Amino acid sequence: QHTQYPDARLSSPIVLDQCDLVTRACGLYSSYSLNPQLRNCKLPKHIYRLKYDVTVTKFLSDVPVATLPIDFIVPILLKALSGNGFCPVEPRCQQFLDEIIKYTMQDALFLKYYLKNVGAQEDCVDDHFQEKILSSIQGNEFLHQMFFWYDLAILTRRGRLNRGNSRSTWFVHDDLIDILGYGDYVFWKIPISLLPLNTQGIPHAAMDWYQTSVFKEAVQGHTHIVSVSTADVLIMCKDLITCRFNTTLISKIAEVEDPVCSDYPNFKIVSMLYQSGDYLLSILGSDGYKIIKFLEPLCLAKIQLCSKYTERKGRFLTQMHLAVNHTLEEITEIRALKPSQAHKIREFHRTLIRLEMTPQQLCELFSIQKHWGHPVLHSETAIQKVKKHATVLKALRPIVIFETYCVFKYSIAKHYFDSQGSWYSVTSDRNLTPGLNSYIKRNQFPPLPMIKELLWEFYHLDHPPLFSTKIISDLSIFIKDRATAVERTCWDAVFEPNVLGYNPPHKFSTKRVPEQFLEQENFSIENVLSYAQKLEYLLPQYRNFSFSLKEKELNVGRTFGKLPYPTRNVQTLCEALLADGLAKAFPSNMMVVTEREQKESLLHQASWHATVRGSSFVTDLEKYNLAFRYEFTAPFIEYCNRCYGVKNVFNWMHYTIPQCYMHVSDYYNPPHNLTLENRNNPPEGPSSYRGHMGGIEGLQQKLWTSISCAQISLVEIKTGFKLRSAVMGDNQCITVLSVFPLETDADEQEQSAEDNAARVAASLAKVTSACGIFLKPDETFVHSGFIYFGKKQYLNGVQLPQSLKTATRMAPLSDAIFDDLQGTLASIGTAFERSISETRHIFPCRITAAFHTFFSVRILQYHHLGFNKGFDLGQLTLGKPLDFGTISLALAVPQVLGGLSFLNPEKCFYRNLGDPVTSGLFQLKTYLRMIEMDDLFLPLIAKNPGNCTAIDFVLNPSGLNVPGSQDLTSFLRQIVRRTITLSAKNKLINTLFHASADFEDEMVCKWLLSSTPVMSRFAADIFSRTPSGKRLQILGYLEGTRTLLASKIINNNTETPVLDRLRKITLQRWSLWFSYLDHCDNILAEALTQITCTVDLAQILREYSWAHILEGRPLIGATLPCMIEQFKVVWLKPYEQCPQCSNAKQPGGKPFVSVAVKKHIVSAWPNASRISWTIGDGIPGQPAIKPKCPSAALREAIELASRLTWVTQGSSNSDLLIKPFLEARVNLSVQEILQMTPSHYSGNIVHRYNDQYSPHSFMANRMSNSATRLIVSTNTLGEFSDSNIIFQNVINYAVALFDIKFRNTEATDIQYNRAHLHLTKCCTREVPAQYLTYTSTLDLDLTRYRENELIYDNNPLKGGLN
């Protein structure tokens, strides 16, 4: 039917070059592009028929010829567009508003009931709670604008289909504004009398396009004017409106929870900020983003001004104020602003400067940077910016390069020595290194303080290769569904022929990675290595390197590079090799906080050759990519080549980049002065150049990070200070430990630490400058207590909240493969969980999520894009209209039972659940108990088991055999397998995907589950180390709907079209939910009666399903109790007796966990009123032979053999079972791998799989401020009632419960001193020691696998043995 699927969210840069074409077809005037070629080119077949469209001519019949740019009008459209007109959409989004409010009220009531039931609730409650929230929701400023913009988005997204002939338009008339839409193009008709005026009498928007005299006669007798834009501006405006609505709603709701002081700024200051920014943008055009960009640094400075106020704390704010004043002054001198406008334009930054809020509120306000839009990008300006800093000449100092290289080598040698035993057998004339000979002979390493007279001796060390080139353990990196550049022969085939002016001679066949990986016959890792070693990237047809403009930002333009396919493979292989070899000698991510560390360990670490003070400073890692030259990076590249067995692999970029012709592959504008004559040797102009001497962002990031770490280490060696570094995103933070005597006071200690940090910063600046890379002293700031880095901000050890950045991104519409409801709901749930992980309030985020869930459900029910207009999903799948009760009930049963619920209240305590089935059962039971529908549990949880194989069971060990709980992954995997069968002449994939691959996978899965008893986690872990796992990981590469609907190989396989299958499966899935009283049976319901236990219920449900897999064998290691139902809280008072431990504890007593509160306060910001504002004191067998540089296959074989040996310990078949698995992985036979397998001697394998192999990291779901103020005792349990208790989740539950209980009360009034967690006597059992028993053997032939990659390798013991 169609191969187009426009997306619902903005994901592309805003370029308006093609709009100049449209205004030429209608007879208007516009100047959006700087390329004169578009001024007189040839119009395409479409957007030329606009001269014959009656609607367009009628629309443009009372407007001037002149137009205005759209970047001056967006704030005006935002301010003056409410929903009061007529729209072609029949079901208006505002119609279903009461139901959303009702659902939000119900969800809030359920959360409150759940909290009261657990035992947290709250003291001194108020009756005026529901009405306050209802008034807050209905009193929002952006309530109707959001619905209107969603209607507009639906209209434009539906209209962007129909790529064929005879396209149509849509019309909207909203009071003052008129909107016309035609095929990705939008016309806005607006009144003139509402535009800001110049001193010459013309609008500010017309200054840069028309002269003062031309515009006046151009308009003359007119009152409305027309602007032209694309469909991306509408999506951007919709996103802005949604973000503003979310922020206002959250800020308003949070005031009800904590009337005294909340952690969000306000709901009135943000509105003034929005208005000021809108006015500034409407006056200054797209150049106002230079001023808007200063919001974050000002917030950082204001946060920094909340401390002891040393002498140099206020320098950052002064520098930022000076910078913003200069920027404001130098962009407004040409423009003829009136004095009133000049006074009014500074209100934004004047309000920002004069703010007075707590650090938490400033940290929250830090996250509204992108609430005003994004600038319009041009290729010429971005290319001009990139050309500078890339062709500039540099001066370097050889001595600093020598020292950095020596430190690089020393760090690599030290990392090799720390692990792996001892030195690496230094060859090459030991007499050339006098001084290291003693250390090598004694088999020791120099400490660190004394390596200053022997640093040069590290230059002469030589050794064999230390790392292997066959350590690839993931084939999914070579097929990732991306786009690459084209061959140099057809380099100009990526531009539109009409704009170009000529038909390109040569054409490319494909431009995507997956449609090139499958047709490469000679693909192999060794082939890639040989391609790199022969300098084949220097061939004349392999030098293109296009640019592509980056996504939504606030700069004038940033780019990223694209390379042809083989060079892309070389780049990927280099990154993969570096991630496993080097760059582990240079630990980048090291997060440490001085106020949250043990004093003894900190003192030991800070000692170089007593209290310890620490300081820090942060520098930027963004532009350094353009500052790298070959003269500086040559020795490091050569050493990296030598550490492997390769010759010319790591210097591909510096060899092939300067030989390329640099240009931006923008579809609607080619390079200037491009003709058919100068096609082979095109000239360079404003958007092209030849000599690129610097590096490229993204590529070779790990090597540059290692070089930066080496420079930091050299600085640390030069000056006797203890330095630690961390690198994330585009920034790095360096902390310095000073160590101080005892009797030195605590007032001048901070000053001395800051002085030491400044000295280290100056030394680092000198060292970095000597290498050709320049720091910014004006931007680098030095502090003592405040550290911000990546996603974590701390102020003197106190963590600061940041929840708006995740909470404001909730939206009913998201890209989730064919607008799947399950994916959208899952994304909303994940966003809610991540947002609640921060902050200390609960209700605003849950209210926002509940608001958006119902809205998404309704908008997908009525306005699905995958079907025709007027289609109703909820009418023809049930036969009757869908009502509120069915939707409300269908949103309460958890997803593990197949019920479209993703907001579990239990996630408010801890992140990872031990067992999802028990938690879902408890949640459903509580929900059904709250309302008067208690006699409804059994029909809801009975259902009908579906059809599945052992593969499905292995994929989801903790899942159930419910058809409605499945995702779309199986469908996509089947499609990809079908495509590979009829295609993929890769000649190495074909060997892996042979005729009987599915049968082999089924046999392996069936054998793995034939044990007694059956264990699922062990089988899942084993299955991933077989060729079946490799095939499974290769199959799953599809990511988007556009790739599915537009891929050539996928859609050329004949058979039924993919769209019909997608519609059929969507209809089946929608019928599965919302139906009820149909897909249930009366054979399991009566067996589940009179149980009254969640663990037994879950076990019976699990065993009833998968019955065709497990005939009669027991299932173990899959059911765990829900900890909410396992413990009970008492909340003792300072001087009281616990009834549980005193009244009925005569015969045996009850084990319990004790929680107590400390008193020492350490630090507090701004006060000690709130618990979350303060932190306290308190911290939250070997193998006989060790292989040297083992391959990935050898490591996987060793791990698999160890697992199989340990799991089956009481039997004598450990020899016969392992052999068939190892025959397909490694050349070595049995009794040789067994020598390298570590001797594992543990008990209760279920405990080892639960909390030793660590499938999940567990951890907490709350801010870590309160965890430092509590002491938890678990030894009181005695015999620990081993058992089903997970201690980490016990600690997390206790800490989170205490935090939630007291979150809106000041600390001086908390009347509870300690808490008792008493375990119930029903949900706790004793787990015995059991071992698996296999009676048969796999007896499958796996010797056919003799290929490269993650498959059988020859000579695995090549690097030697320890």
Binding site: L393, K394, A395, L396, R397, P398, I399, K534, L535, L538, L539, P540, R629, Y630, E631, A634, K647, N648, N651, H654, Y655, P658, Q659, R690, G691, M693, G772
Partner: protein, 72 residues
């Protein structure tokens, strides 16, 4: 006779060797001192020269046309 000849051979240049060792030490130290005051600039034909040299050291022949950025 032979012992006298051996003594003469073993004692004739040793004084010259001792004189030469001090001069060599001085000149090496003074060159090391010079090395710390150098300034190097970056040219636009370093990568091209390195690529050509690497290509000549494997299937020795000039790289295929057209010419590189700065062929000199």
């Amino acid at each position: 006779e032979q012992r006298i000849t051996s003594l003469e051979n073993g004692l004739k240049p040793v004084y010259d060797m001792a004189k030469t060792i001090s001069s060599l030490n001085r000149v090496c130290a003074e060159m090391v001192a010079k090395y710390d005051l150098l300034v190097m600039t970056t040219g636009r034909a370093t990568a091209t020269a390195a690529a050509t040299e690497a290509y000549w050291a494997e299937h020795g022949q000039p790289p295929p046309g057209p010419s590189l950025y700065e062929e000199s």
